[PDB]
């Protein structure tokens, strides 16, 4: 014989909140008969099982724990079924120096080694849905992920680990909400926070309610990816529930296209383990021994974990191979069994069975997707090797994975084209005509029709209007010439040049009619030849002090206006924000209003004096009618075009068009009227 | 005598701090057991107690529990347990052997369920026994809105969850439900942003000094807020950082601590026959070597509780110790029946049992700048909240209770300033209607030394209409005895504009005709041309009448109110003040008032420029216009300075009104004064 009966305590919840004991008990009976049937596993000993029901109730469980612990004989390894009973026995196992092995405890708090140093579990915990989730996020580079959970310990203990795991991947979790049984307000908050990818952690009976609510708010569709758990039945969105008013195919349309992360329960291949069996003979033996139906019993999916749960400890005790005399006081046998169980690594019915440093066993997660009314596999994963296998059956909205919301900045285009070029060629014709007429006037300065006294102020007006026709062009467009992004430099240069040019030209224009009104109301001095011209030139040069004061305290700014609404585009989810630019300052509006008022003051003074001295005669007699008509044109032009360039910003056919038409029509028409009677009657 | 065995599960060591609790509660229970040995109380048994050290580690406690079960005699009940986990697991497991657990330090509300724990009882008041107390305290001084502040631990969040369940049904508001973990400073930020009157704190001891230290920085204290804090900390708790007692001490007044009371409040005879004072003297002289715990009252009480329970079960035993293993449950059911209806008076008061709990005495207290003095009690058995008046204090006179209560009023003007201007109202008007009679004296005694017969009459008409408008300007604004007079703002602004254009038209058309006869070359002396000048003034008059109906059409210009909000307090009361100013405009008539002021400026600067010209034109055909330019300059500067100061004001509605009255009584009589002050002086030589 020599059959030393080594006894091992166990526990199987036959009913209650987790009826796993209906399925695990024939499984552990098969596994104990299998290790009995091999002498390689049993050199000298023989494993025996003593067990009691607990219904996942700690009150009965503590009583049964005492009943097995303080009776005879001495047990070594314990086996708790449910989760809370496993926590209770692993908390208190340290005072007897025992090692405990669970097979269903998905408690993520059971990974602690301080409170639980001597505990392992073949069933993986719930935190191994998170590395596959973060790898599925790393495949597509999504950065704004929102989470919603039922207010439960088994989900709040998962999502914080998901946070402190995803923070190393550089993906932020923005909206982290929670509810208990009211699904309306959290999906209201999610619609108001309009997130893209949504992760959920909840059971089936509230899953139906939250999917009725998300059908009602219309938050499914194109840019929405739903991550859920996968241990629901394949029919779960089909059983009639009167708790929600949503219809069945309206629910089916709502649940369409979401990714599920299950976990494996058996060998995906058809190989043979050290147990020398496959999946099919195992399922046949379970249907033989189980008097119930596998479709109606509980714990049938976790039932293959019991087989290698027995087999791992059996191989560990065979590796220890001074064993039949264990007592709870000593520690060396316990440390030897713990060291043998630490290095457990082989191939069993659930695939490769390796424990981590904490005590959990890693496994594979069959990542799937609901694709049109039925579940279908996407692929597999293993955490220890990053071998993200694939099968390419994931349908999408158009084939591509929809991602987080982005934005395109579109710069508001000008019309630097032939419309700009007609303006530029009219400016060039004005420039050539003005400088040619000014050179012709300077090269007539011996003796002429109008004598040498008067039109040197007219020459200075020609210089000023030439500077206006030289400052009309560099107001720019939406970045069109060699070298850009110096827009404050070119705007301040153009503005300073146009200010000095218009100031010079209009001052030397207006001073002649001021002095002919002065000589009309003097009842012929011209006291010094540059007296009147120099004092009106200093009146002009007062304005460059205003320009310098504008340059000292707030010279320049390149602002950005965002006048239009984002996303007017029709098919792509990239929001188009049209932004424009006009060169500005810190507070320029009241400043430009004050400057317009000052120039309007001088211009209305000129337009009143022009009606004043409309009929006179002096030494410079052949100038006043044409000078007055030019004043009458330039005043109404500048006053009719100051507000439409002050208050406008749409430069396409209105702002720059009206401003350029004003300035070039002003200089063009005033010169082509002011030089008709001179050169035509000089050689007429 | 045959013993009745009982088991105590107490920390007896010197390592764990709960060993101090066990060493403090052992003298009271040995005093109770020796008094029970003195009296008969039994027939003819005697009680025995076996102590078992736990240290309230779960594994060690369950191992000692198993050792006591396996090795001790046939126990009947089980007693003790202080740490909540090692009480909770045994109270869950209790239904196996069908025993009863009596605790005196289980202070967790998770033991409230009887579906979880049907065989468990405790005499210590739980943390849920402060929530009706705080309800009665809030209803004693009529509070509605309160703000909570809970540390994110399971016990504090559980009492926060039951806070809503106890306040469901009454006039209570919960605004700021902030629940921080380790940053209380943003919680004080959010609470001051929601400016809630009452703080309902829920945290441990070490967080409290940090809470007060970074609540001093926001100054969330004073005679405006109260602080309801669980005050079961150690005495002189504030000694445990980087802050200072100056920024700690000035926020701990109005600080209300809600604890459970150790003893009774009387010198009354208990079930022992003695008084609480004599019991307390015997307790503190029983051992004289231990710092006294705050649980020995309930420890002394529970012995009499279980003794009365077994005394109430002995007659049902006689209806049958000698017939009870750990397996029987019917005897334990009779034990539950005799235990549940326990009702007598002990050291803590009249003990009851409403589903495993007795209504205790809640001791309110206040830190009165040196210590937390006891201020009030409450018994949930009778639901009456006693208070000790003439002992509580407040930094304010009245106990603050200060919701943010607001008040508003109109902006008033200074009446000794307004009254002298109302006295200057009449003189310009009477001088106007008298100088009009001097002009009719020129009509009645004909010698036409001036212009057209209607011109100075138009000047006097403009002056009278301006002096009526500036009088009825602020009498309708500030003095609100005529309330619907901001509608009459539109009924007086047309009067003011007509007076302005009449006066400046009589200033302007005359000077324009002087310009039109100065720039001629041959001759100009016509009376029909002066008729043309008067109808030319009438043309811009009817143009301004069209502008008047355009002002009626562009906006109603109804009564609007600017609500200027700064909220100070002049005498310490929390009823804040925010003033409001009447505004006649409709805030989109800026284009309208801009074009009206531009109309007036373009019509006004004509004469201001022309005064530079006609300063030497001494035309005797009109016999005037030598000082009229000196008038028009000295009114053209003042009208624009009045408009400039008017638009640069209404920040204070007093200075703007007195300065526009000052410039109006400047201009509207300085025109008449500088048009007549050499006139009658030379006509009365
Ligand atoms: C593991 O069990 C198999 C069971 O194989 C089945 O039963 C056998 C009787 C045979 O008919 C197989 O074809 C069946 O599939 C054992 O299988 C065979 O054993 C023989 C022994 O001589 C060997 O020659 C075959 O190659 C085996 N075939 C296979 C597929 O394994 C096998 O021996 C068992 N292994 C151990 C280590 O026990
Ligand atoms: C179970 O334990 C026994 C020893 O108690 C192992 O038996 C020996 O294992 C070594 C391993 O290197 C082999 O080389 C020997 O041939 C084995 N001898 C015998 C008599 O079996 C046995 O391998 C263990 N079983 C396992 C690991 O499955
Ligand atoms: C197995 O037991 C060892 C006990 O030593 C655990 O600790 C490791 O010990 C080795 C040396 O013995 C060190 O090199 C490692 O660095 C230790 N691990 C860590 C995480 O520091 C070990 O974790 C246990 N588990 C496994 C899977 O080896
Ligand atoms: C168990 O406790 C409850 C709660 O006190 C008891 O109910 C009270 O019973 C008394 C009579 O014994 C009545 O006067 C009270 O009105 C009851 N309370 C209420 C709220 O109605 C109950 O009787 C106890 N049961 C036993 C067997 O003692
Ligand atoms: C939604 O469903 C509820 C039952 O859960 C039902 O009472 C209610 O009338 C439904 N709402 C409708 C039909 O608008
Ligand atoms: C204080 O309260 C007691 C309670 O009865 C009352 O008798 C007493 O008059 C009160 N004293 C004052 C000053 O309010």
Swiss-Prot record, chain A:
A GO cellular component entry from the record: Schaffer collateral - CA1 synapse
Consequence when changing residue 123 to A: Strongly reduces signaling via G-proteins. Abolishes antagonist binding
Example GO BP: positive regulation of glutamate secretion
Result for mutant: residue 233 to V: In NEDLC; likely pathogenic; results in decreased G protein-coupled GABA receptor activity; does not affect surface expression of the receptor
Documented effect of changing residue 204 to D: In NEDLC; likely pathogenic; results in decreased function in G protein-coupled receptor signaling pathway; decreased surface expression of the receptor
Side of membrane Extracellular, spans: 1-419, 481-495, 554-590, 648-655
Keywords associated with the record: Cell membrane, Cell projection, Coiled coil, Disease variant, Disulfide bond, G-protein coupled receptor, Glycoprotein, Intellectual disability, Membrane, Phosphoprotein, Postsynaptic cell membrane, Receptor, Repeat, Secreted, Signal, Sushi, Synapse, Transducer, Transmembrane, Transmembrane helix
Chief location bin: membrane
Residues bound to baclofen: 83, 106, 123, 203, 302
Topology versus the membrane: Multi-pass membrane protein
Tissues where this protein is expressed: Highly expressed in brain. Weakly expressed in heart, small intestine and uterus. Isoform 1A: Mainly expressed in granular cell and molecular layer. Isoform 1B: Mainly expressed in Purkinje cells. Isoform 1E: Predominantly expressed in peripheral tissues as kidney, lung, trachea, colon, small intestine, stomach, bone marrow, thymus and mammary gland.
Cysteine pairings via disulfide bonds: 56-82, 212-246
Entry binding sites for 4-aminobutanoate: 83, 106, 123, 203, 302
Sites carrying sugar chains: 245, 276, 318, 330, 342
Spans traversing the lipid bilayer: 420-440, 460-480, 496-516, 533-553, 591-611, 627-647, 656-676
Keyword Coiled coil: yes
Disease tied to this protein: Neurodevelopmental disorder with language delay and variable cognitive abnormalities: An autosomal dominant disorder characterized by language delay ranging from mild to severe, varying degrees of intellectual disability, and learning difficulties. Additional features include early motor delay, muscular hypotonia, behavioral abnormalities, sleep disorders, and seizures.
Assembly information from the UniProt record: Heterodimer of GABBR1 and GABBR2. Homodimers may form, but are inactive. Isoform 1E (without C-terminal intracellular domain) is unable to dimerize via a coiled-coil interaction with GABBR2. Interacts (via C-terminus) with ATF4 (via leucine zipper domain). Interacts with JAKMIP1.
Comment on protein domains: Alpha-helical parts of the C-terminal intracellular region mediate heterodimeric interaction with GABBR2. The linker region between the transmembrane domain 3 (TM3) and the transmembrane domain 4 (TM4) probably plays a role in the specificity for G-protein coupling.
Assigned protein family: Belongs to the G-protein coupled receptor 3 family. GABA-B receptor subfamily.
Name listed for the protein in its UniProt record: Gamma-aminobutyric acid type B receptor subunit 1
Organism: Homo sapiens
Gene expressing this chain: GABBR1
Residues of the full protein shown: 165 to 862 of 961
UniProtKB/Swiss-Prot annotation, chain B:
Tissue expr: Highly expressed in brain, especially in cerebral cortex, thalamus, hippocampus, frontal, occipital and temporal lobe, occipital pole and cerebellum, followed by corpus callosum, caudate nucleus, spinal cord, amygdala and medulla. Weakly expressed in heart, testis and skeletal muscle.
Main location: membrane
Domain of life: Eukaryota
Gene Ontology BP annotations: adenylate cyclase-inhibiting G protein-coupled receptor signaling pathway; chemical synaptic transmission; G protein-coupled receptor signaling pathway; gamma-aminobutyric acid signaling pathway; negative regulation of adenylate cyclase activity; neuron-glial cell signaling; synaptic transmission, GABAergic
Transmembrane segments: 420-440, 459-479, 488-508, 534-554, 591-611, 628-648, 657-677
Extracellular-side positions: 1-419, 480-487, 555-590, 649-656
Disulfide pairings: 56-83, 185-214, 213-243
Entry-listed glycosylation sites: 38, 325, 340, 389
CC terms in the record's Gene Ontology section: cytoplasm; G protein-coupled GABA receptor complex; G protein-coupled receptor heterodimeric complex; GABA receptor complex; neuron projection; plasma membrane; postsynaptic membrane
Location in the cell: Cell membrane; Postsynaptic cell membrane
Topology class, membrane: Multi-pass membrane protein
Molecular function via GO: G protein-coupled GABA receptor activity; protein heterodimerization activity; transmembrane signaling receptor activity
Effect of residue 66 to A: Impairs interaction with GABBR1. Decreases signaling via G-proteins
Family: Belongs to the G-protein coupled receptor 3 family. GABA-B receptor subfamily.
Free-text note on domains in this protein's UniProt record: Alpha-helical parts of the C-terminal intracellular region mediate heterodimeric interaction with GABBR1.
Subunit structure, as described in the record: Heterodimer of GABBR1 and GABBR2. Homodimers may form, but are inactive. Interacts (via C-terminus) with ATF4 (via leucine zipper domain).
Reported function: Component of a heterodimeric G-protein coupled receptor for GABA, formed by GABBR1 and GABBR2. Within the heterodimeric GABA receptor, only GABBR1 seems to bind agonists, while GABBR2 mediates coupling to G proteins. Ligand binding causes a conformation change that triggers signaling via guanine nucleotide-binding proteins (G proteins) and modulates the activity of down-stream effectors, such as adenylate cyclase.
The name this protein goes by in its record: Gamma-aminobutyric acid type B receptor subunit 2
Organism annotation: Homo sapiens (Human)
């Amino acid at each position: 014989s020599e059959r030393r009966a080594v006894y091992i305590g166990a526990l199987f919840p036959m009913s209650g909140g987790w009826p796993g004991g209906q399925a695990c008990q024939p499984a552990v009976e098969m596994a104990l008969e299998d290790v009995n049937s091999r002498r390689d596993i049993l050199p000298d000993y023989e494993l025996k099982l003593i067990h009691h029901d607990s219904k996942c109730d700690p009150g009965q469980a503590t009583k049964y724990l005492y009943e097995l612990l303080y009776n005879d004989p001495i047990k070594i390894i314990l086996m708790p079924g449910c989760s809370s009973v496993s926590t209770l026995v692993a908390e208190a196992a340290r005072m007897w120096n025992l090692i405990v092995l669970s097979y269903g405890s998905s408690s993520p708090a059971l990974s602690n080694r301080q409170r639980f140093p001597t505990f392992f579990r073949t069933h993986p915990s719930a935190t191994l849905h998170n590395p596959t989730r973060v790898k599925l996020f790393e495949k597509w580079g999504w950065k704004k992920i929102a989470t919603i959970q039922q207010t439960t310990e088994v989900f709040t203990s998962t999502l914080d680990d998901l946070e402190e795991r995803v923070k190393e991947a550089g993906i932020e979790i923005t909206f982290r909400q929670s509810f208990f049984s009211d699904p309306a307000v959290p999906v209201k908050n999610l619609k108001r926070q309009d997130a893209r990818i949504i992760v959920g952690l909840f059971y089936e009976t509230e899953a139906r309610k939250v999917f009725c609510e998300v059908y009602k708010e219309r938050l499914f569709g194109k840019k929405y990816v739903w991550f859920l758990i996968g241990w629901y039945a394949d029919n779960w969105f089909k059983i009639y529930d009167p708790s929600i008013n949503c219809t069945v195919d309206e629910m089916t349309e709502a649940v369409e296209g979401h990714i599920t992360t299950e976990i494996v329960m058996l060998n995906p291949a058809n190989t043979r383990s050290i147990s020398n069996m496959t999946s099919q003979e195992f399922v046949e033996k379970l249907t033989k021994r189980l008097k119930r139906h596998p479709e109606e019993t509980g714990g049938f999916q976790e039932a293959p974990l019991a087989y290698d749960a027995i087999w791992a400890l059996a191989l560990a005790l065979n590796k220890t191979s001074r064993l039949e005399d264990f007592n709870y006081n000593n520690q060396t046998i316990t440390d030897q069994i713990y060291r043998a169980m630490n290095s457990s690594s082989f191939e069993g019915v659930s695939g490769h069975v390796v424990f981590d440093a904490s005590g959990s066993r890693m496994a594979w997660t069959l990542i799937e997707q609901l694709q049109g009314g039925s579940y279908k596999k996407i692929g597999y994963y293993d955490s220890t090797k990053d071998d993200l296998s694939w099968s390419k059956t994931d349908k999408w909205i158009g084939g591509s994975p929809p991602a987080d919301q982005t934005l395109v900045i579109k710069t508001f285009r000008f019309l630097s084209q032939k419309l700009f070029i007609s303006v530029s060629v009219l400016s060039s014709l004005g420039i050539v005509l003005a400088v040619v007429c000014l050179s012709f006037n300077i090269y007539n300065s011996h003796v002429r029709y109008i004598q040498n006294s008067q039109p040197n102020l007219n020459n200075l007006t020609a210089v000023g209007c030439s500077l206006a026709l030289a400052a009309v062009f560099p107001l720019g467009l939406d970045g069109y010439h060699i070298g850009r992004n110096q827009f404050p430099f070119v705007c301040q240069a153009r503005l300073w040049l146009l200010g000095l040019g218009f100031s010079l030209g209009y001052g030397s224009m207006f001073t002649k009619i001021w002095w002919v009104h002065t000589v009309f109301t003097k009842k012929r001095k011209t006291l010094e030849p540059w007296k009147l011209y120099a004092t009106v030139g200093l009146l002009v040069g007062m304005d460059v002090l205003t320009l310098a004061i504008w340059q000292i305290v707030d010279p320049l700014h390149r602002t950005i206006e965002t006048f239009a609404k984002e996303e007017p585009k029709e098919d792509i989810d990239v929001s188009i924000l049209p932004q424009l630019e006009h060169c500005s300052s810190r507070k320029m509006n009241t400043w430009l209003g004050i400057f317009y008022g000052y120039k309007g003051l001088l211009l209305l003074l000129g337009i009143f004096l022009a009606y004043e001295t409309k009929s006179v005669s002096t030494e410079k007699i052949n100038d006043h009618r044409a000078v007055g008509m030019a004043i009458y044109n330039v005043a109404v032009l500048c006053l009719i075009t100051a507000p439409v360039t002050m208050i406008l910003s749409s430069q396409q056919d209105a702002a720059f068009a009206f401003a350029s038409l004003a300035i070039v029509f002003s200089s063009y028409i005033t010169l082509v009227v002011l030089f008709v009677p001179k050169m035509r009657r000089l050689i007429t | 005598s045959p013993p009745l065995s009982i088991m105590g599960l107490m920390p007896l060591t010197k390592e764990v701090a709960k060993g101090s609790i066990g060493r403090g509660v052992l003298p009271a229970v040995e005093l109770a057991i020796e008094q029970i040995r003195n009296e008969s109380l039994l027939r003819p048994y005697f009680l025995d107690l076996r102590l078992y050290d736990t240290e309230c580690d779960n594994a060690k406690g369950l191992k000692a529990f198993y050792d006591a079960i396996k090795y001790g005699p046939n126990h009947l009940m089980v007693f003790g347990g202080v740490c909540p986990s090692v009480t909770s697991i045994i109270a869950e497991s209790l239904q196996g052997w069908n025993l009863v657990q009596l605790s005196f330090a289980a202070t967790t509300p998770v033991l409230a369920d009887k579906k979880k724990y049907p065989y468990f009882f405790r005499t210590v008041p739980s943390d849920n026994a402060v929530n009706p107390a705080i309800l009665k305290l809030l209803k004693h001084y009529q509070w509605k809105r309160v703000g909570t502040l809970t540390q994110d631990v399971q016990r504090f969040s559980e009492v926060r969850n039951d806070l809503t369940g106890v306040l469901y049904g009454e006039d209570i508001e919960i605004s700021d439900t902030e629940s921080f973990s380790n940053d209380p400073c943003t919680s004080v930020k959010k609470l001051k942003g929601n400016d809630v009157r009452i703080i309902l704190g829920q945290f441990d001891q070490n967080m409290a000094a940090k809470v007060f230290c970074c609540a001093y920085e926001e100054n969330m204290y004073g005679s405006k807020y109260q602080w309801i804090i669980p005050g079961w900390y150690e005495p002189s708790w504030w000694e445990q950082s980087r802050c200072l007692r100056k920024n700690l001490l000035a926020a701990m007044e109005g600080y209300i601590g809600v604890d459970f009371e150790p003893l009774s409040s009387k010198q009354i005879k208990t079930i022992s026959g003695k008084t609480p004072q004599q019991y307390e003297r015997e307790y503190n002289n029983k051992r004289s070597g231990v710092g006294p715990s705050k649980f020995h009252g309930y420890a002394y009480d529970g012995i009499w509780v279980i003794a009365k329970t077994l005394q109430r079960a002995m007659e049902t035993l006689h209806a049958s110790i000698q017939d009870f293993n750990y397996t029987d449950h019917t005897l334990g059911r009779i034990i539950l029946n005799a235990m549940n209806e326990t009702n007598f008076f002990g050291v803590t008061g009249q003990v009851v049992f409403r589903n495993g709990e007795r209504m205790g005495t809640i001791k309110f207290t206040q830190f009165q700048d040196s210590r937390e003095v006891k201020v009030g009690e409450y018994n949930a058995v009778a639901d009456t909240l006693e208070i000790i008046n003439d002992t509580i204090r407040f930094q304010g006179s009245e106990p603050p209770k200060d919701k943010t209560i607001i008040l508003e009023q109109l902006r008033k003007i200074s009446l000794p300033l307004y009254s002298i201007l109302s006295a200057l109202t009449i003189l310009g008007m009477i001088m106007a209607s008298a100088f009009l009679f001097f002009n009719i004296k020129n009509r009645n005694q004909k010698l036409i030394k001036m212009s057209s017969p209607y011109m100075n009459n138009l000047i006097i008409l403009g002056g009278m209409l301006s002096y009526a408008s500036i009088f009825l300007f602020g009498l309708d604004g500030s003095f609100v005895s005529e309330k619907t007079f901001e509608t009459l703002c539109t009924v007086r602004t047309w009067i003011l504009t007509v007076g302005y254009t009449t006066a400046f038209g009589a200033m302007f058309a005359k000077t324009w005709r002087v310009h039109a006869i100065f720039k001629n070359v041959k001759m100009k002396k016509k009376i029909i041309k002066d008729q043309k000048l008067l109808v030319i003034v009438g043309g811009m008059l009817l143009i301004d009448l069209c502008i008047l109906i355009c002002w009626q059409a562009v906006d109603p210009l109804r009564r609007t109110v600017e609500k200027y909000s700064m909220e100070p307090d002049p005498a310490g009361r929390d009823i804040s003040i925010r003033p409001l100013l009447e505004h006649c405009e409709n805030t989109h008539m800026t284009i309208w008032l801009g074009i009206v002021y531009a109309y007036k400026g373009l019509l006004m600067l004509f004469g201001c420029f022309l005064a530079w010209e006609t300063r030497n034109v001494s035309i005797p055909a009109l016999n005037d216009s030598k000082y009229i330019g000196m008038s028009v300059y000295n009114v053209g500067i003042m009208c624009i300075i009045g408009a400039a100061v008017s638009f640069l004001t209404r920040d204070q509605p007093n200075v703007q009104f007195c300065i526009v009255a000052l410039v109006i009584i400047f201009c509207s009589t300085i025109t008449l004064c500088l048009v007549f002050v050499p006139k009658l002086i030379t006509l009365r030589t």
